[PDB]
RNA sequence: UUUUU
RNA sequence: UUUUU
RNA sequence: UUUUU
RNA sequence: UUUUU
RNA sequence: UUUUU
């Protein structure tokens, strides 16, 4: 009489078995819903990110409360300039009309496995920041200018450490693939 | 078709790998299937090349737990 | 009833967190609006520029009031001739119909990290100066002639130390990319 | 139900055993976290450093309070000039515009196993000092000039007694390897 | 910049 | 990033 | 995976 | 078959 | 390890 429903994982499906015992736990698998970025190797683990954050905070001898401002400045600077392992010298923050420099050693030396993977944690906020800045003036990150990005509307994706995810425009995905290929090309 | 395909590890090889990875983690019979769920999802996201090294990640809710990748690749 | 607005940075966005504490300061990030050229590594820092300016002023034994004229002349000379680290000898100013030479050592030796990055601070004024000079006669900087720039309308961008920014024509950006590639090519 | 964690040192690992008894103490090994430079033979032991410091202080008949200034001067002088066992004569400090010389015998004779290994204790402070000096003028240590170091940004690593550690740039590591090979080459 | 006989 | 004289 | 300054 | 991180 | 003045 009633219309019969179907289970997400069908009852009769070939399953990995060891010693004639199912190797997976379906009860947990159905409820296991980890975000794509939390189980990606292209992004530094939470432990690695915490280690790097603590190391950089200790290197600058900066307190807990002041560190987030430094992190805002570092994210913006990385948005402008690449996050390669080779960057050296000092990165710059603007305290209004005054320029303050911080050493880049602590950031690159403690960033494991890479500074790009560490900054991947800031990818969404970098997107939002570029969106905000573009709402008030033409703000193409310098990485996009180096790559000769002509779209202009792709500025929000045109930084070195952008983490490509499932919920990104296909246009943005293709643009970033092309940009990475061009940058890696000698 | 999949039980007589060389593109798929034999049942004996799969059992050997499963036992080796279970022994490497010092994990019991009951807890291993959860680790296998996490490993399958991680492999779904990231490739299954012989070169993958470091740690693969499971999510115990909002907490990230890492397991060494050596036992998985060396015994496979 | 009323149409509901949306925040620039959405409330529910993945954020970098260390020890279950947000790593960024949104209050400051929203108000953090640093110019693109003030946080660019392709441009010498303000401290480095001040150090170079002071060093060059002291080398010439020139006063505070007379230095800006020397800087005008140096900017024009760099517009004509490249800003490579190799330039040696004397650069030239015109005191009317009289030619006065200044040693190039102090300019190149004190210019850190590079003379190009130091002259990047003069990029906008160089643009304006080339515009002005072109309004009265054909004035293509010698760097554009060496690069065989045929457009003519791109003269305003055809100098060695032009700082490419977000608000530059796409035509100018492509032209300068091609010119830099040609110059670096052996 | 819960996701099972793993121990840093797995329970079932082959261990060195003598007479069927584990030779290592895991409890202490897990907590044993000695800095890399504190267990390196390329650096004089703390006892050797104390012996050398006491010997040099006694040779100069200088008090406890005045010795650190002499040590600052000696570190800077060693930064400029090499720390070979052959250096003889007097090393120089600047008391403003006045030059004061100290005999080099006490420093080299009491420095065991080598003066380079003794000065390795000053490596980090030498790095910082070169960084500071470079922030105000081009300051390449004379050892870098003798080695013909062209990078300029590597000045902070371009002294004889630099102690290569895990947290040093790969660029700096390669540069110092090349510099040491060139210096040792006849 | 030099290197155009 | 540098390498455009 | 890394390699995008 | 392997080689897809 | 030493050998870098």
Author numbering:
A (entry chain Ag), C (entry chain Ae), D (entry chain Au): 42 to 227
B (entry chain Ai): 77 to 152
Original authors' sentences:
Potyviral CP plays a role in virtually every step of the viral infection cycle, from transmission of the virion by aphids, virus assembly and disassembly, regulation of genome amplification, protein translation, to cell-to-cell and long-distance movement. CP consists of a highly conserved globular core flanked by two large extended regions with a high frequency of structural disorder. The C-terminal high intrinsic disorder region (C-IDR) is partially conserved and packaged in the lumen of the virion, supported by the helical ssRNA scaffold. Here, we show that we can control the shape, size, RNA encapsidation ability, symmetry, stability and surface functionalization of nanoparticles through structure-based design of CP from potato virus Y (PVY).
We prepared VLPs consisting of the CP units lacking 40 C-terminal residues, i.e whole C-IDR (CPΔC40), and analyzed them by cryo-EM. Interestingly, we detected only two different architectures of filaments. 65% of them had the stacked-ring architecture (VLPΔC40:r) and 35% had left-handed helical symmetry and encapsidated RNA (VLPΔC40:h+RNA). The structures of the CPΔC40:r and CPΔC40:h+RNA subunits and the helical parameters of their VLPs were comparable to those of their wild type counterparts. This indicates that luminal C-IDR is not essential either for filament formation or RNA encapsidation. The absence of C-IDR facilitates the accessibility of the RNA-binding site, resulting in a significantly increased proportion of VLPΔC40:h+RNA filaments. VLPΔC40:r and VLPΔC40:h+RNA filaments are long flexible and hollow nanotubes with an inner dimeter of 4.1 nm and 3.7 nm, respectively. Third, we show that RNA can be encapsidated in VLPs even in the absence of C-IDR. Here we show that C-IDR does not play an essential structural role in the filament formation or RNA-encapsidation, however, it does affect the fine structural details in filament architecture.
